[PDB]
């Protein structure tokens, strides 16, 4: 995201990147969010 903002990347690129960043942060805080995908550990086991 920092590099995209530095380069002035596409607004939709930055929007999707911010969406993924928000997803990652919220998932780290809580992996049992209602009606949202679960973050696996590349082996099918949901992260704690």
Partner 1 sequence: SGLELYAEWKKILLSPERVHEIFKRISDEECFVLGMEPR
Partner 2 sequence: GYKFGVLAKIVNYMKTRHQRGDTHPLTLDEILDETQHLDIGLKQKQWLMTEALVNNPKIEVIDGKYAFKPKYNVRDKKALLRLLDQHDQRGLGGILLEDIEEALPNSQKAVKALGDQILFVNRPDKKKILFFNDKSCQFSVDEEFQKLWRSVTVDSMDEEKIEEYLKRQGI
Partner 3 sequence: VPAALKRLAKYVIRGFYGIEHALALDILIRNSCVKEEDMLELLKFDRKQLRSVLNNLKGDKFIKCRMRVETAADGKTTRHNYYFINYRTLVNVVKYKLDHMRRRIETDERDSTNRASFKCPVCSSTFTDLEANQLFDPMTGTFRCTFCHTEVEEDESAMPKKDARTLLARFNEQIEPIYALLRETED
Binding residues (CB under 8 A) for partner 2: these are: 5-8
Spell out the alpha helix ranges (H) of the chain: 2-7, 11-29
Instruction: Give first-to-last CA distance, the chain, whole Å.
Output: 25
**Among positions 12, 42, 45, 48, the unique one binding partner 3 when judged by CB under 8 A:** 12
Q: Structure tokens of 17? A: 């990147």
**Among positions 2, 3, 6, 11, the unique one binding partner 3 when judged by CB under 8 A:** 11
> Looking up tokens 């530095």, which residue turns up?
6
Instruction: Choose between 10 and 36: whose C-beta lies nearer to partner 3.
Output: 10
| Segment contacting partner 3 by CB under 8 A, of 10-18, 19-27, 31-39, 40-48 | 10-18
């Amino acid at each position: 995201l920092r590099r995209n903002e530095q380069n002035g990347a596409a607004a939709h690129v930055i929007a999707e990147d911010v969406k993924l960043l928000q997803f990652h942060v919220a998932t780290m805080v809580d992996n049992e969010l209602p009606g949202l995908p679960r973050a696996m550990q590349k082996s099918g086991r949901p992260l704690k």
